[PDB]
Write a protein that binds this DNA or RNA. Structure first.
Ligand SMILES: [Ca+2]
Length: 337
DNA sequence: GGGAAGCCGGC
DNA sequence: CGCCGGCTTCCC
């Protein structure tokens, strides 16, 4: 398999500089409100210590010279959509992982030769750069997971590569904390059990391991540690779809809300097109503007009716638990196929 | 079935 | 930047 993973560097900030070039070379911080937080920081801003998730208040007191802009999501979606469309032209299959990440299966495209894959990846960085002035990072590897890992090692504006010949040697010297699913709490204690690198997984009690990691993840690590891990690039998009409609007025009455919720399972569902969700979320935004959501997960796609049936059920649950008044109601679909 | 808990990771 | 939206597993 030949996977190219493409990661748009600090995408929201890059989009702002492309739109407003006078922002280039000065700190720029993109802000998100739900006090607000940093969604993205450009280079000069990051260089001063501004990080994603940081409260705007703390950011200002380390980058007072930064320009702080509000997040303009619809326009970032427009750029992303365009770049995704550049991508799928070069791919057999493309998995959109988020607004700024995509995995391309180009196996059948470079006629199976990893070398022409690397060059394809170059052409792809250059194309995006010429046409959209967006710099991206790419990783080229035999699978999705390796492609990502080496991509993150190559930040920013990079091109990282793990040749099929190098896979085993690479997997071997790989620290355990560099592995997705392995956060701080359990890296800490895989270390306490003598596991420092992914190879150490091979030489361990599978039961003393299992009891802290979990069955499915122990499996994951084993399969990974022996180059027997491979999940395919599914041709799809993981970006949640849905819309939230503003109501006539505040309401906590199930029957007043019900049709509003029912109509959102149209205004979005038409735009949903071919893809089929496994998860439903009713999103309620209070008069307070707080977000109250009840999601459920079903190992089955979602017909128009399977929504309604579980829709109001979840709307119930929301009303039956929160006391706040509700101003807008909506729906979010995820886990597509 | 589905809520509580712990963990990961994106923001 | 330390917090809370998805997944997995424990528990009732
Ligand atoms: Ca990233």
């Amino acid at each position: 398999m030949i996977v190219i993973f493409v990661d748009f560097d600090y995408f929201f900030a890059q989009v702002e500089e492309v739109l407003n070039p006078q922002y280039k070379g000065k700190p720029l911080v993109v802000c998100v409100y739900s006090s607000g937080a940093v969604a993205t920081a450009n280079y000069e801003a990051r260089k001063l210590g501004v990080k994603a998730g940081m409260p705007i208040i703390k950011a200002m007191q380390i980058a007072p010279s930064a320009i702080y802009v509000p997040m303009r999501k619809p326009i970032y979606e427009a750029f992303s959509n365009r770049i995704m469309n550049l991508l799928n032209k070069h791919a057999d299959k493309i998995e959109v992982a988020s607004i700024d990440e995509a995995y391309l299966d180009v196996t059948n495209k470079v006629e199976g030769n990893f070398e022409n894959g690397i060059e394809l990846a170059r052409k792809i960085k250059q194309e995006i750069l010429e046409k959209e002035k967006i710099t991206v990072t790419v990783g080229v590897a035999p699978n999705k997971i390796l492609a990502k890992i080496i991509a993150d090692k190559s930040k920013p504006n990079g091109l990282g590569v793990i040749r099929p010949t190098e896979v085993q040697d690479f997997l071997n010297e790989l620290d355990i904390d560099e592995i997705p699913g392995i956060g701080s709490v359990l890296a800490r204690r895989l270390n306490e059990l003598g596991i420092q690198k992914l190879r150490d997984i091979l030489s361990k009690n599978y039961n003393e391991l299992e009891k802290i990691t979990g069955k499915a993840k122990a499996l994951y690590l084993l399969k990974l540690a022996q180059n027997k891990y491979s999940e395919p690039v599914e041709n799809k998009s993981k970006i949640p779809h849905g819309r939230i409609v503003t109501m006539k007025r505040n309401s906590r009455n199930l029957e007043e809300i019900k049709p509003y919720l029912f109509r959102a399972i149209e205004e979005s569902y038409y735009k949903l097109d071919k893809r089929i969700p496994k998860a439903i979320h009713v999103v309620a935004v209070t008069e307070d503007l707080d977000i109250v959501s009840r999601g459920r997960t079903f190992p089955h796609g979602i017909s128009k009716e399977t929504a309604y049936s579980e829709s109001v059920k979840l709307l119930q649950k929301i009303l039956e638990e929160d006391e706040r008044k509700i101003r807008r109601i909506g729906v979010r679909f995820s886990k597509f196929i």
